[PDB]
Design an enzyme around this catalytic site. Sequence first.
Site, PDB file in Angstrom:
ATOM      1  N   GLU A  74     -19.964 -39.216  32.912  1.00 26.53           N
ATOM      2  CA  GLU A  74     -21.110 -39.703  33.418  1.00 26.53           C
ATOM      3  C   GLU A  74     -21.304 -39.659  35.184  1.00 26.53           C
ATOM      4  O   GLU A  74     -20.689 -40.275  35.695  1.00 26.53           O
ATOM      5  CB  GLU A  74     -21.649 -40.875  32.870  1.00 26.53           C
ATOM      6  CG  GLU A  74     -21.316 -40.917  31.343  1.00 26.53           C
ATOM      7  CD  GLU A  74     -21.494 -42.411  30.691  1.00 26.53           C
ATOM      8  OE1 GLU A  74     -21.162 -43.432  31.452  1.00 26.53           O
ATOM      9  OE2 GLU A  74     -21.958 -42.551  29.705  1.00 26.53           O
TER      10      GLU A  74
ATOM     11  N   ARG B  99     -18.232 -41.318  36.967  1.00 25.64           N
ATOM     12  CA  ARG B  99     -17.104 -41.922  36.171  1.00 25.64           C
ATOM     13  C   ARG B  99     -16.076 -41.061  35.875  1.00 25.64           C
ATOM     14  O   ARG B  99     -15.822 -39.797  35.359  1.00 25.64           O
ATOM     15  CB  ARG B  99     -17.630 -42.263  34.693  1.00 25.64           C
ATOM     16  CG  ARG B  99     -16.852 -42.548  33.543  1.00 25.64           C
ATOM     17  CD  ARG B  99     -17.889 -43.073  32.462  1.00 25.64           C
ATOM     18  NE  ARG B  99     -17.100 -43.370  31.258  1.00 25.64           N
ATOM     19  CZ  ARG B  99     -17.587 -44.149  30.158  1.00 25.64           C
ATOM     20  NH1 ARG B  99     -18.836 -44.317  30.228  1.00 25.64           N
ATOM     21  NH2 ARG B  99     -16.741 -44.371  29.090  1.00 25.64           N
TER      22      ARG B  99
ATOM     23  N   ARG C   9     -16.146 -54.752  31.225  1.00 24.36           N
ATOM     24  CA  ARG C   9     -17.644 -54.358  31.347  1.00 24.36           C
ATOM     25  C   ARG C   9     -18.390 -55.871  31.631  1.00 24.36           C
ATOM     26  O   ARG C   9     -19.050 -56.455  30.758  1.00 24.36           O
ATOM     27  CB  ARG C   9     -18.261 -53.628  30.427  1.00 24.36           C
ATOM     28  CG  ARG C   9     -17.775 -52.206  30.465  1.00 24.36           C
ATOM     29  CD  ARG C   9     -18.327 -51.178  29.341  1.00 24.36           C
ATOM     30  NE  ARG C   9     -17.854 -49.935  29.226  1.00 24.36           N
ATOM     31  CZ  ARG C   9     -18.141 -49.092  28.851  1.00 24.36           C
ATOM     32  NH1 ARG C   9     -19.039 -49.075  28.004  1.00 24.36           N
ATOM     33  NH2 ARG C   9     -17.365 -47.869  28.794  1.00 24.36           N
TER      34      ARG C   9
HETATM   35  C1  DAN Z   1     -21.611 -38.354  23.527  1.00 29.51           C
HETATM   36  C2  DAN Z   1     -21.420 -39.822  23.505  1.00 29.51           C
HETATM   37  O1  DAN Z   1     -21.838 -40.639  22.628  1.00 29.51           O
HETATM   38  N1  DAN Z   1     -20.785 -40.249  24.643  1.00 29.51           N
HETATM   39  C3  DAN Z   1     -20.729 -41.857  24.820  1.00 29.51           C
HETATM   40  C4  DAN Z   1     -20.110 -41.920  26.227  1.00 29.51           C
HETATM   41  C5  DAN Z   1     -19.063 -41.031  26.762  1.00 29.51           C
HETATM   42  O2  DAN Z   1     -18.324 -40.824  25.183  1.00 29.51           O
HETATM   43  C6  DAN Z   1     -18.027 -41.487  27.618  1.00 29.51           C
HETATM   44  O3  DAN Z   1     -18.608 -41.287  29.078  1.00 29.51           O
HETATM   45  C7  DAN Z   1     -16.776 -40.616  27.496  1.00 29.51           C
HETATM   46  O4  DAN Z   1     -15.603 -41.152  27.410  1.00 29.51           O
HETATM   47  O5  DAN Z   1     -19.708 -43.468  26.412  1.00 29.51           O
HETATM   48  C8  DAN Z   1     -20.612 -44.438  26.008  1.00 29.51           C
HETATM   49  C9  DAN Z   1     -19.948 -45.882  26.079  1.00 29.51           C
HETATM   50  O6  DAN Z   1     -19.748 -46.369  25.048  1.00 29.51           O
HETATM   51  O7  DAN Z   1     -19.577 -45.938  27.029  1.00 29.51           O
HETATM   52  C10 DAN Z   1     -21.534 -43.945  25.473  1.00 29.51           C
HETATM   53  C11 DAN Z   1     -21.811 -42.537  25.103  1.00 29.51           C
HETATM   54  O8  DAN Z   1     -22.867 -42.588  24.001  1.00 29.51           O
END
Ligand code: DAN
Lengths: 521, 521, 521
Positions: A376, A392, A456
């Site tokens: 992200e 991230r 978090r």
């Molecule tokens: C496709 C998907 O759902 N991705 C998920 C995301 C991601 O998996 C992480 O950035 C990879 O490790 O993480 C989170 C989280 O709970 O923090 C929510 C997102 O909904």
Amino acid sequence: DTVFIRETQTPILIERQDNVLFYIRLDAKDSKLLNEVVLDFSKSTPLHDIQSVKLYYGGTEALQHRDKKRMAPVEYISGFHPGTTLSANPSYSVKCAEVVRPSNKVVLKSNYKLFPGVNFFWISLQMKKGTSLYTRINSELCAVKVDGKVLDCKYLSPKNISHRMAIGVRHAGDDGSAAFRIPGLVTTNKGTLLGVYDVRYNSSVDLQEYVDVGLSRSTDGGETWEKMRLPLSFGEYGGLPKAQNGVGDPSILVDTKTNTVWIVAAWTHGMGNQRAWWSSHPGMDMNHTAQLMMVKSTDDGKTWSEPINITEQVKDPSWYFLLQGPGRGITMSDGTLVFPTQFIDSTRIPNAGIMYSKDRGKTWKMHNMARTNTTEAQVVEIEPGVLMLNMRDNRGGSRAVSITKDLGKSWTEHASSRKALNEPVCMASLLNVKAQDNVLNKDILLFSNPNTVKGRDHITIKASLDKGLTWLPEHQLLLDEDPGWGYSCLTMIDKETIGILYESSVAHMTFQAVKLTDLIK
Amino acid sequence: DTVFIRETQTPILIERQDNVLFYIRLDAKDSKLLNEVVLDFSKSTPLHDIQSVKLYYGGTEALQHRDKKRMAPVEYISGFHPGTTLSANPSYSVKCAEVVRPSNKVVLKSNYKLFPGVNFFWISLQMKKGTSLYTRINSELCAVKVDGKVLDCKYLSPKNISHRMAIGVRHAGDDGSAAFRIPGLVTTNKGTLLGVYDVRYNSSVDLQEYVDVGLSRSTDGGETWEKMRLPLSFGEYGGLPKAQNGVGDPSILVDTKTNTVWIVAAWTHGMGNQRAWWSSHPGMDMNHTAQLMMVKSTDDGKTWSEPINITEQVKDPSWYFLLQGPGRGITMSDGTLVFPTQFIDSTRIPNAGIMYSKDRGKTWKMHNMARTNTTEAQVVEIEPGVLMLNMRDNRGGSRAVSITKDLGKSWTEHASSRKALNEPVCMASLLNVKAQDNVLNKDILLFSNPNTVKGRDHITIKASLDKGLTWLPEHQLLLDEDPGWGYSCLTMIDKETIGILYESSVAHMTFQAVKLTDLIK
Amino acid sequence: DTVFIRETQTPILIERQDNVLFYIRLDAKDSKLLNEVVLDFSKSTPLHDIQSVKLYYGGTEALQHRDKKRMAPVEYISGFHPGTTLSANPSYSVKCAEVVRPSNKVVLKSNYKLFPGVNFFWISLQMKKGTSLYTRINSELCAVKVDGKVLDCKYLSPKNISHRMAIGVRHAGDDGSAAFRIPGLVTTNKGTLLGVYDVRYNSSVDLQEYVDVGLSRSTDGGETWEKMRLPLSFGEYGGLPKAQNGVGDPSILVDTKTNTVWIVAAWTHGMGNQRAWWSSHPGMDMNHTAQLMMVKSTDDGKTWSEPINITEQVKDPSWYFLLQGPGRGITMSDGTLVFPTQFIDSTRIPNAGIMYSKDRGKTWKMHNMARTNTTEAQVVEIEPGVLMLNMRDNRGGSRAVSITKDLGKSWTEHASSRKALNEPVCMASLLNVKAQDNVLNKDILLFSNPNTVKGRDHITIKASLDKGLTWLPEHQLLLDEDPGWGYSCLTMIDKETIGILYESSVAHMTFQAVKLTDLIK
Ligand SMILES: CC(=O)N[C@H]1[C@H]([C@H](O)[C@H](O)CO)OC(C(=O)O)=C[C@@H]1O
Ligand SMILES: CC(=O)N[C@H]1[C@H]([C@H](O)[C@H](O)CO)OC(C(=O)O)=C[C@@H]1O
Ligand SMILES: CC(=O)N[C@H]1[C@H]([C@H](O)[C@H](O)CO)OC(C(=O)O)=C[C@@H]1O
């Protein structure tokens, strides 16, 4: 004796019946009565805005647990159990005293009988319904009187805490949804606030599931919010159940040249009840891989188009999973619209990048990844024509930062990368506020995330005055010390005020307003 | 193609809008249409009791998860989500077809378009409101037609399943309580059914917490149940929060000499929010150790005395924790009342035993433990003056069984011990029915337990015709193959019928009636 | 006061300088002196075999840890630190007293100053160099005397414990190897014992690594063992490091028609330093997949042939990993040689089976799997032409058991599968002893494993007299209550005596001899 006191650093939800202000713990086993507790609210406090201060008793502690010096036996108020987050759980606390419409001095007379052992108490703060988001509450614990003696206080929290307000735009259980997650936030050219999020109806779990993208709209700087809209939802498309049609992880931007608003989100079709991170596979149609869907609004966010499938414009078929970076996007000075992105490549490694449109959102393109094993990200135009991507990083411990002058054709590692901004591996928000658009007449880069390397919690806003090279501690504000799900998104409410929508310890979608001059004095 | 079929062996809740009768899995990836499904209810089936038969579509499966050959992508109907256990989650299933008031042959015409891959369907059964607990449903899946072809059905479940009704005496979320656990059940001398249980208001976790002992009373053999009563509750005793005042793990018995009904339970005071298993400590008073509390009723269960604290009569001060064995107790032929017990000794080892009263419940006595490292047990008078104690054993694998002819001064290992009755380490019910008191005119020992060595599923009643020396497979009935919390308690509704109250996959307090002649043919 | 006593149920290594016989814990805080401890050895005990009995002080306990009621603060003797497993760690124990050459009554006079709190002691038993594997030590704790007073003993261990001797065929550190694992054991037609195992030179970790197959040979029924041999070792084959050439998980069998002895093992080539379970891939050659290698001895196990690569004979190319089931194989009644096997199929799922040879080991064949998601297994001929395969099952909790009458073409589920025999997901040994080959003149099926559902401890031998349908508690023997790595392998030393080589809490390769009449009286 000694009385442990812990003052909280957590959002005060205006709409809440109880808000934990102080935890109190007494260890003496020979004591009989808590006579009173005395507080003082400074004259800087808008005193007319406090509806009530209460004293609650929380009982005692298990004998084998007392060594740990916990400040309460249990969570007195939940931010996560659907339908009951606005009030203290009455089975956990016994109200001992109350002062309604308090003055500066508050004297909570309880004369409450004590357990022969540990005794827990806490102080609840309740605001008046129409309270302003800018109200700040300062509170001094003056005295704890037990068995006729005023005891010596040992404080586990810093002095001079200022308690800030918040509004829960969404709470667990609202509108029939168990949970709300992944926030995005922007301010239109007309000053309207638009916050997007996952509406996770069945549980808090990620896609795949019954998930819509919802939106709250405010025309008064976030004091009030309009009934939730659903800019993206796919129902039983193709005949499959709603829970095999979720759409989420929204990202929103305002096209500042025209005030057209865009939302991009990832639509998962099928995949059983498994997680899309592992269930999206190579291909391009919905039966194989997640779909990149976009909606637009040309009426300041009030209504929304039907989704447009832009998957084919940007996705390499060898990729397992392409989606936007959650949060927000931007309009560059030259009119280019940019959304952060992330894709899982053929080797099942995620890599962050950006997509961009030079034709007002009609066509989008992706050039090259910024860095391997990142997910992200958020992006900003740190200089005219120069994009900064803040990512991230699955290596852990800190955000990766990269620069591109060619919309992602080639990338450079920024000097702050993997050093200056710590993270627990979580979504983080980045927003640049140009000198011309804020009252300090200086470029200010803002960052928000959980200020840790594990866990978090301690959601914090940080500010940089040198285009992100240094983040001085004095230009940071702690917003929420307690645990939550950690995601956040920043925006400027006006030329002098920051707005933030984030997943907090008190509400799934928490909104707060912070004066720029509070971060930069 | 092939169409995998699995018929369920699970309680049919009368009050539920849906009940899973068949799971259907289709693997053809080249198929286009599910035309119809054909069902047949035998003439033995009371068809006038069926409100509706439905065909639901459950979507497809993640491509990487198809290895495991399940029969559905998700749990379609929840037995545990508070407030929503009586209907299928509409986001997980799309209704394709429905036949109201079916005849013997049922044609579920759907012409439903299929996914290019796995497709899940299931058949729902809904009974009418007045349906009897004795209704049996036999159902034959005649045909599944895809693209005009009747496919080959491969069944994963046995033939001649007879589906049995049940009633949810308590459901998750009822009367404001998150959960209900730990069932006990007896039949008064008037034929009244009395079922007891924990009312666990905040969550399903064990003591300590906000827990009351509740009771449901039925005067029509379990077809209907009166409004829940609270024979034991301590509120804010001593000024502590309700959650630091729970009482639970009830055991109930009928003094057959007088029809006085007795309930014993463990009351935990203080202890923070920790588990009583670790937080109850040596001593005798409530500020140190769990208290053994008793209430009685002399009006056939309608009203209940105030609690009597009998701790000092039976508890050794060095024990950490003394409590009853949950479920029920007995009246011996000579009038002695007996409750199974369990205590954690100074070594932190738990040990099962019994406590007894020779004066109609006015005073109680304990002698010696039956076996080390055992916890929950149930007892019967297997011959005059000879008590059999059947015990949850922490060594694992199987129930311990011991005999005492002097009310627990000395114990002998029974021949069936640690060999015949398998368990996953869980509560089990034991009940002895003398030849003169049942329609088969044979002495019958009954046992109910999750028939596994791992996992709390396949709740089963087993019967022994030689006083517990042997448990022949033909004298066993599977009631619930799906997972649950596992506890159960038996009673005789009448000379021809067994009643069982247990934690099931479909309701927290599930009641069923089982004819002795189904067990012993 | 009270004195907590725990007598051990663990192998007494003849070669150890110390063996923990009793743990002693005293909780009295006002006490000053441990005057003495008095022990009694029965006259069944060959007293002439005891070199020494010692009293050791282990100090005190952390104040926050005391409620856990542990019987020692630390492990006094290590079975796992290379090179130091034969003596008590002197930094953890202070010697208070010693009786060399004890008589029946043993008085350990200490007059030891006690900590004002918890005090730990323990009693050490040291055997004489030449003690026999059949020696049995029965010991009674007569008195613990503190401040002149004989204390009340609270036993945590059963009465009538018989302590059994053991010989550590291999200890951590021996012959330059950090570890030894994965035992197999057989008896040749001449009565010679052959024990095989991994020699894991660098650490205990699984392949890939520097691993050989080692072999210990005994001509005197296991009292003494010949210098270690290496039937399989590959060195720097192909020019790769020794740690990219390991071979392990041996399985050994005696062709009883000819007394030829066979060992099959899995040779992994390359694969860096990763685990072969994930690094072996589809294909057939050594650069892609683990190789099935075989050696034979025709001189009663003294010398071994060069390895034969039989992979091409039985491996399907699409499998990720084919290997033997560790332990032993059989020679069927008709001369067929059989090794259990396990393969990871193209879907990454492991499945157990068998391979066989009808030409005295020249060529080998595999037909079809016995069951999905199973790994390590052992096989017996439960009746002429009928093979029973007893399998480690990834579902958890219990062994799967299947039957084939056609050498694996078709399989039938045994009545005992997933019910009768307990398990923590670990290797288990199965060995069938025909009526004419043992002194009870009865068919006896033997089983050995960790007798738990979780945790590798309580290594136990179980016997069945009805061909594996029932496993009665009275026909079981606990060998080692403490945690170990859990693998074992059985053999008949002679018609009256079982032998077992296993990973124990006291030595990596632990050998014990057990009379058949001790299991079945
Ligand atoms: C496709 C998907 O759902 N991705 C998920 C995301 C991601 O998996 C992480 O950035 C990879 O490790 O993480 C989170 C989280 O709970 O923090 C929510 C997102 O909904
Ligand atoms: C005090 C207490 O709550 N004990 C708990 C009990 C007990 O702990 C176990 O029998 C021995 O460990 O277990 C369970 C259970 O469903 O597993 C329920 C009881 O409520
Ligand atoms: C190839 C390999 O290493 N097999 C290993 C085995 C296997 O991994 C498991 O049986 C399936 O997962 O487990 C163990 C173990 O002590 O647990 C030892 C074996 O060396």
